[PDB]
From a paper:
The hMPV genome is a single-stranded negative-sense RNA molecule that encodes nine different gene products, including three glycoproteins: G, F, and SH10. The F glycoprotein is synthesized as an inactive precursor, F0, that requires proteolytic processing to become fusion competent. Cleavage generates two subunits, F2 and F1, that remain covalently linked by disulfide bonds. The mature hMPV F is a trimer of disulfide-linked heterodimers that is incorporated into virions in a metastable pre-fusion conformation.
A single proline substitution in combination with modifications to the fusion-activating trypsin cleavage site and the addition of a foldon trimerization domain at the C-terminus of the hMPV F ectodomain generated a soluble construct with antigenic characteristics of the pre-fusion conformation. Crystals of 115-BV were obtained in space group I213 and diffracted X-rays to 2.6 Å resolution. The asymmetric unit contained a single protomer of pre-fusion hMPV F, with the trimer axis aligned along the threefold crystallographic axis. The structure contains F2 residues 19–90 and F1 residues 103–472. Overall, the structure of pre-fusion hMPV F is highly similar to pre-fusion hRSV F (RMSD of 1.4 Å for 428 Cα residues), despite relatively low protein sequence identity (38%) of the mature ectodomains. Electron density corresponding to N-linked glycans was observed at each of the three predicted glycosylation sites: a single N-acetylglucosamine (GlcNAc) was observed at Asn57, both core GlcNAcs were observed at Asn172, and a Man2GlcNAc2 glycan was observed at Asn353.
Residue numbers in the entry:
A (entry chain F), B (entry chain F), C (entry chain F): 19 to 90, 103 to 472
Write the structure that this text describes.
């Protein structure tokens, strides 16, 4: 990793990250076979088996009041919530195909002689179909034989404990779908075991290196996917799991951090703040800007981003890290007439905007307070310090390793006359700030 | 459903939705009876029963370090987080009444001879009271008799397994309240079973059709409610569940989507974006605008909205979908001098803002890439395509069925001279953009 | 608590709150000993013990595809998400030290003869180390002896049920880390029991009163901390729990609420809205402003705030509650030319902005609709009413007790000529609104 402190704008850019981009969704349809449990009855009073049977029938009946479909410029603000909404739209759209009675029987037909099969739906979409039959097999082969004419308080406690082991997964699947109205927020271990997740990732329509990274880091696949209830069909619970396809890996990414750049003359301030902070990743000849926090996530040098969360930006947008004052690109900034003191942590350090009214210092976990910082924008290396403080507020630096570089330059905010600085601006092109000053003076 | 593409503003409006509005809260107070478990002791070493007894006493003691109260213009930004905060304020306010010692004894008195009773609190609020006594009954009638003088390693394993079945609900109730500091985020199956949820909804102060919809879709009632711990009173755990009352159903709702409308002349751009996107629902003679995402949620043609999340808007606000340029209503927009290419998915299609610098196409799940899109704002029907792409970013269209209509009109952005277009604006009335151009030229 | 209604700005300030500020993180490292389970085999077919053994080995193997690090001006917008990101950076930074093989052996060495030990890491940071050995002890001392040559279908069901009791905690630890990709969102009862949480809080580097408050309210410590997986080392699962250190308590805090202040003349409106809403707390000679919702949380008179979420503001910023029009502090506001009717709930009442187009009233839970409100900004006491409504939207008031006071003053919005009121402003200093009017007229 290589981090550049951009002195002219009180910002950093950290390069050397490797992309892991979610480019598609792989659909794994499940049929969890429960078995013939309605036709089982316990009439000999309270029992361990009766308790497990009553839980199982109550969970199966509860599943029918759950339904996932039919009833039973500020760049960051433009992209906010898009990927999350896009994920639900995609999942609900294919669930509409799967929910058809004919599509379900076709799924069950593909699973008659095996526990896994690749299937194509009526809309031409290819999915993986998986059967889960232990509970049905236990009910048919073992439990029903032991309840000869409705006597469940049998001396075999192994049978009662076996029942509670075999129905645990089905009960959790019902809990997770009933609590979330049919759309789970993630892929639990009851929707998809480790073996099933490894089997589904291996079947994804992408290349070997992508599948190897997803297999070796499948807890992240778990975290980025979700499950949708399709419905109950006979004694089978049918749901689908949307698995993220990380189809592009190891392309260049970089992150931009920024803090308020304030310059003062005669007690008055001119301040600006870069509004292009966040992650950038390249793919197939274009650069995508991911302006919102929840949309990208690092694991070491790799950054996991949802492509549906980004905005395609021009290549020239990188000149905001180069010649922000003179560039022809409309570099986005906000402005203020009064300073904000704060800390913007970087991958390899911290940006410290320390202005009049606060005290700032850097600290060591072994040695304590190292030094007080001077007023202005300061760049602290995580080799220089372990913590940075604004007054008493502690900011713990990362310990990520990499080379830091200072790209010298007079802060653009220093060129402003505070007496002529415009009204506070929010997410405006920087040349519109200059245009405001130049027009108001003419 | 009927979707109109508004060519003059690069936006859509989809009508035909049916409201499900949360209008009130129904309070269900629970007394979970644990029984006399403190006066039980296991002195014969490690045991299955001892393990279950130690879990139960540890969970009961842990519940006393949990407390829910006392210690032991940009329309979207104005409404953000209001409903969530309002829900907690309402729940904490009535929990203040219920937490009184006199109010608790009155609740316990109403439940002496039955497991459910309608009760009125000292503040005149009517609640449902529910008793849960299995664990107390098992402890009193069964477990205590088997521990004759502190010997728990008894040959009866049925007793140990029965204990672990009977205490499971109480342990989960303690887990859910301890992890969330007394205020659960939703209504779990341990706070309220399917039968208890069906009983509470049936007792709600609303009409039959509302109760029928809530009963048949009670997983959504689960998802929109939450639970508050009241405290431990003797051997009884007392909590309350706030259940959403969907008191208004099947009134007209509609959703507005929008994408940047950009017009270019001689390499310069004038762009605007509608800032009135989101859900609108009518009720009792007024129109409520729900500007934030998490506040409404669809299930087919029905949309579930929290009324505390909306802003009452004038009826005339709908003319932004009709005569946005000439209307007297202050239609909210943002502006830019440079284009943003993006996709805004609609219920029945997609708005594609495709401008210089990116490539856009529409695809089919059977046939592949259908066609490249021309530069400008395009409306794609979900009958025309299955996916829309900006460069490599895929947006999956919905498969919702309904009639699409194009309402022709010259884009308002085409009327602007880019050389005279104002500084970037955020959530301003559209006539203030024209006023800025007209004033700056005078 | 003492609440002041500020008539000149349609806002309230509520004083008398006591701070509970998260000032640091205490790290509790765990080694959960699983035991020699790989070298156990069941070859006699299906068994209860085999099922528990297969779950345990599958959970142990699944834990190796989980990794938390390396792969296997608008004040509110500036501070949004800072504390959450800072918490993860701090936790990942110390996990980098703990993940070293030498650091792990040192932790295991400190725990050889005891279940708890204070240890200092190579980076000079002091942590608490905790061992959890029941599952290993059960596997070594009890389970392995019962499987004499791979026969697990033994007549001892006590052994099978004991196994399922002893492995429950380890299975849940694996579930919570696998679902969240190694970084749990909170501290569950399986990461840290009540006794371990009480032991860790008692060891925190803070004063007695802070530890007593944290001990007596440790469910909030649970809610504000989280856990990070370090890895699997032999048969030991190693994770760390970041516990919030509430190192400052009972210093003054106050909250500011606001609603649109609109004045109309001849059918035209001039409106402003205070944009300094939120929590303020004092500490060590400075005032910190917490502009975002999720960053502070009340429990009675105490408010729990994360210090990493705030912005250090000048003491003079409080004059926005005193002389907002004449003060030299740049009091932040937004503006509009058209009114927004809404309700801003206060700790001891409600601000009601009731303008043309809507109807507003206050209600009682015993008596019903009390009275219709007049147009303008109204302050309702929670002693006056139980609910406030805008049209049909109900806002339930709190029942918090305290003294209310009206600080009389002509609304600043009344001083504006609507015909000369500027374009809509977002988060601008109030004197810049006056400057816009005065400059545009010159
Ligand atoms: C802000 O900074 C960016 C990045 O530094 C800068 O963009 C760069 O501009 C230079 C201007 O020369 C580009 O270099 C040119 O590239 C073209 C081909 O595309 C060449 O034909 C040019 O060659 C001429 O000049 C050479 C000497 O400089 C001669 O050797 C040659 O014979 C030609 O006369 C020249 O190399 C460069 O490609 C871009 N870089 C990128 C990545 O865009 C931008 O101009 C700056 N903006 C400002 C300050 O206005
Ligand atoms: C933007 O579009 C909206 C919606 O299209 C539009 O609002 C509409 O304005 C028309 C103007 O006529 C309204 O229709 C009038 O309604 C009143 C009663 O409220 C009638 O008295 C009027 O009748 C007169 O004109 C009729 C012929 O048009 C004659 O037959 C009659 O004898 C009268 O002379 C007339 O019907 C209409 O009600 C509204 N619609 C709504 C829902 O508000 C608005 O004016 C447009 N704004 C612009 C472009 O400035
Ligand atoms: C907006 O309101 C705030 C708060 O009310 C206000 O700040 C206050 O200003 C007064 C102005 O007098 C300050 O009081 C002064 O404090 C200094 C010491 O710091 C004293 O030297 C001054 O004493 C002189 O005046 C006294 C009589 O008023 C005489 O008795 C004495 O002999 C001196 O002549 C005086 O007490 C006060 O400290 C501040 N308060 C705070 C907390 O800042 C602000 O000025 C207002 N802004 C406006 C309306 O412009
Ligand atoms: C359910 O019943 C089947 C059939 O009796 C059991 O499977 C048999 O197990 C014995 C060993 O006890 C083997 O010798 C047989 O070959 C098995 N037969 C078949 C068809 O698999 C099974 O163990 C029972 N399940 C439980 C949990 O007890
Ligand atoms: C707890 O003890 C009660 C009382 O002995 C049990 O209830 C009895 O069950 C028998 C059948 O075994 C019936 O014939 C009696 O009529 C029941 N009596 C009453 C008063 O209900 C109960 O089954 C025991 N519970 C458990 C879980 O074993
Ligand atoms: C695991 O085995 C140990 C050793 O046999 C058991 O501990 C003994 O328990 C008996 C009572 O049954 C005591 O009299 C002994 O003093 C204990 N010995 C030791 C060394 O602790 C232990 O109970 C077994 N665990 C389980 C769950 O059965
Ligand atoms: C219960 O028995 C009836 C009659 O034999 C049968 O038609 C029905 O399918 C059975 N139920 C299940 C779930 O198999
Ligand atoms: C335990 O026994 C004492 C004395 O008999 C009694 O007062 C107390 O209420 C009992 N505890 C419970 C929880 O019933
Ligand atoms: C299993 O047995 C081998 C050989 O005795 C030993 O080296 C290994 O450490 C054992 N596994 C565990 C987890 O102890």
């Amino acid at each position: 990793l290589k981090e550049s402190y951009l002195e002219e704008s009180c910002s950093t850019i950290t390069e050397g990250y490797l992309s892991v981009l979610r480019t598609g969704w792989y659909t794994n349809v499940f049929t969890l076979e429960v078995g013939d449990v309605e036709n089982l009855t316990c009439a000999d009073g309270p029992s361990l088996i009766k308790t497990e049977l009553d839980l199982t029938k109550s969970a199966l009946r509860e599943l029918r009041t759950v339904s996932a479909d039919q009833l039973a410029f500020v760049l960051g603000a433009i992209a906010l919530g898009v990927a999350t909404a896009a994920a639900v739209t995609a999942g609900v759209a294919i669930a509409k195909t799967i929910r058809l009675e004919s599509e379900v029987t076709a799924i069950k037909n593909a699973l008659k002689k095996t526990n896994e099969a690749v299937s194509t739906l009526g809309n031409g979409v290819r999915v993986l179909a998986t059967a889960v039959r232990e509970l049905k097999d236990f009910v048919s082969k073992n439990l029903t034989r032991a309840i000869n004419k409705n006597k469940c308080d049998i001396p075999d406690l192994k049978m009662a404990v076996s029942f509670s082991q075999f129905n645990r997964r089905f009960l959790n699947v019902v809990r997770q779908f009933s609590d979330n109205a049919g759309i789970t927020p993630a892929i639990s271990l009851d929707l998809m075991t480790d073996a099933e997740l490894a089997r589904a990732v291996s079947n994804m329509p992408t290349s070997a290196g992508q599948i190897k990274l997803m297999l070796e880091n499948r807890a992240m696949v778990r975290r980025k996917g979700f499950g949708i209830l399709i419905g109950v069909y006979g004694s089978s619970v049918i749901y689908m799991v949307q698995l993220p396809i990380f189809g592009v890996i190891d392309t260049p990414c970089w992150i931009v951090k920024a803090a308020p750049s304030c310059s003062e003359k005669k007690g008055n301030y001119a301040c600006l703040l870069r509004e292009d902070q966040g992650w950038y990743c390249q793919n197939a000849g274009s650069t995508v800007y991911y302006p919102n926090e929840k949309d990208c996530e690092t694991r070491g040098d790799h950054v996991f981003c949802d492509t549906a969360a980004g905005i395609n930006v021009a290549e020239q947008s990188k000149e905001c890290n180069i010649n922000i004052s003179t560039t022809n690109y409309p570099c986005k900034v906000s402005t203020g007439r009064h300073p904000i003191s704060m800390v913007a942590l970087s991958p390899l350090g911290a940006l410290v905007a320390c202005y009049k009214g606060v005290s700032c210092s850097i600290g060591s976990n072994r040695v304590g307070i190292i030094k007080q910082l001077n007023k202005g924008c300061s760049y602290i290396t995580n080799q220089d310090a372990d913590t940075v403080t604004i007054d008493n507020t502690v900011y713990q630096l990362s310990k990520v390793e990499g080379e830091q570089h200072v790209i010298k330059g007079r802060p653009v905010s220093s060129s402003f006359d505070p007496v002529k600085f415009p009204e506070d601006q929010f997410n405006v092109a920087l040349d519109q700030v200059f245009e405001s000053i130049e027009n108001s003076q003419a």
